[PDB]
Every structure is written in C-alpha cells, then in structure tokens.
Ligand binder design. Structure first.
Ligand SMILES: O=C(Nc1ccc2c(c1)CNC2)c1cncc2[nH]ncc12
Lengths: 39, 156
C-alpha cells in the first residue's frame, strides 16, 4: 500500500539555479499515454 | 489525514525499505499526480485514506478526493520553475525555459531537465507560484536524456 508525506510549499524561488535547454521536438502520443520521437 | 496544500512524496513499502515512486500536489483538498505513479490505486495519508476520483491513461493524470483543480498554463514565452522533489533528496526549484512538443493535435510545453523516474508528478510553476503542469511524461532524446512535457489536466 502506497502513502504520501509532505515535502514543502509551492512557491517560486527568486535566484534559483537556471539550467536546461528549450528544444523543439516532433512527438507522437499513443493510447497508452506514451510519447515517441517522430522523424 | 493531512490535507494541507503543498507538494508531497508518493512512497511504498512493498519493496526493500521505503521507495519513492513519485510526487504529487495537494490543492483544494485534491491530490494530483501522474497515473503511472499510482496506477489508480488508493493512497494513505497517516490514518486517512485517499480514494481516486478521476483518471486517464492517455493524459497520464489522476486526482484523489475530488476533481482536477489545477488550471494554470504556460504562456509560451516565460521561464518556468520545476519544483523537483527527487528521491531521498530535498525539494528544489530549478528554473528553465521550456521547449515545445509539436504533435498532430497541437503544441505542448516541455521542460528539458533529467531526473529519476521517482521525481514523476513534480509541479512546474509560473512566476506567480501557480501549477502549470506536472513533470514525468515525455521522451528520450538522442543523448539518452529525458525531456518531459508540461502535463496539465482540465478543470470542469
Ligand atoms: O518513465 C518515465 N515516465 C513514464 C513511465 C510510464 C508511463 C509514462 C511515463 C506515461 N505512460 C506510462 C520517466 C519519468 N520521469 C523521468 C524519467 N527518466 N527516464 C524515464 C522517466
């Protein structure tokens, strides 16, 4: 049996670690909610 | 049990020790998470029980105690903050500019940040603190990395 535990508040943090790119990917979504890379 | 608004870890004792299978958002007495985290199963909150209300395998979303409450959306221009709650590690806001998933049914936001599968259900936030979607459903790019979509449900 699964259970939940509090992890914190939902607030925006000013001066947080800015990382990661912004790619434009061509994807397909199947009936099972799974994404796939279209080419 | 605890219905206080905030971000929560989804855990299980069915394996060795205590294993984090995902994350979720408590908002307006409703627990929101990704379907692949719980598989529609009931959750426990102390002595209390959370029974599922709504769910969909294609959207990969599931709500507990009531209907989906989150309705904010990425504006297509601003940087967002993934409130990453990783397994065993402390909650941590990571700022990023999202990419785009182009599909036959329209474009969706996408955060290009790699995290373990146990991070699934971690909220993605706007500068207002609103939950614009959940992290955990995306694709594996050429460099093995994960680029998850910004998965938001529908508020009736
Ligand atoms: O495996 C992951 N996600 C997932 C799993 C099962 C299903 C779906 C998504 C939607 N349909 C069912 C995953 C989530 N987070 C981070 C990751 N890194 N590598 C994989 C991941």
């Amino acid at each position: 049996d699964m259970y939940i535990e509090r992890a914190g508040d939902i607030t925006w943090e000013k001066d947080a670690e800015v990382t990661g790119n912004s790619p434009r990917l061509d994807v397909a979504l199947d009936e099972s909610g799974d994404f796939s890379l279209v080419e | 049990g605890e219905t206080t608004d905030g971000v929560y870890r989804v855990m299980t004792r069915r394996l060795l020790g205590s294993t984090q299978v995902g994350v979720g958002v408590m908002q307006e007495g409703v627990f929101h998470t990704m379907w692949h985290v719980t598989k529609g199963a009931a959750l426990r909150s102390g002595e209390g029980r959370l029974d599922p209300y709504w769910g969909d395998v294609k959207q990969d979303l599931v709500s507990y105690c009531g209907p989906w409450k989150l309705d904010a959306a990425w504006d297509g221009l601003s940087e967002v903050q993934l409130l990453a709650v990783p397994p065993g590690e402390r909650a941590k806001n990571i700022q990023t500019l999202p990419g785009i998933f182009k599909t036959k049914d329209g474009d969706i936001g996408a955060v290009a940040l790699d995290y373990p599968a146990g991070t699934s259900g971690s909220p993605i936030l706007d500068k207002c603190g609103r939950v614009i979607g959940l992290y955990g459903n995306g694709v594996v790019i050429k460099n093995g990395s994960y680029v998850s979509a910004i998965t938001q449900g529908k508020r009736e």
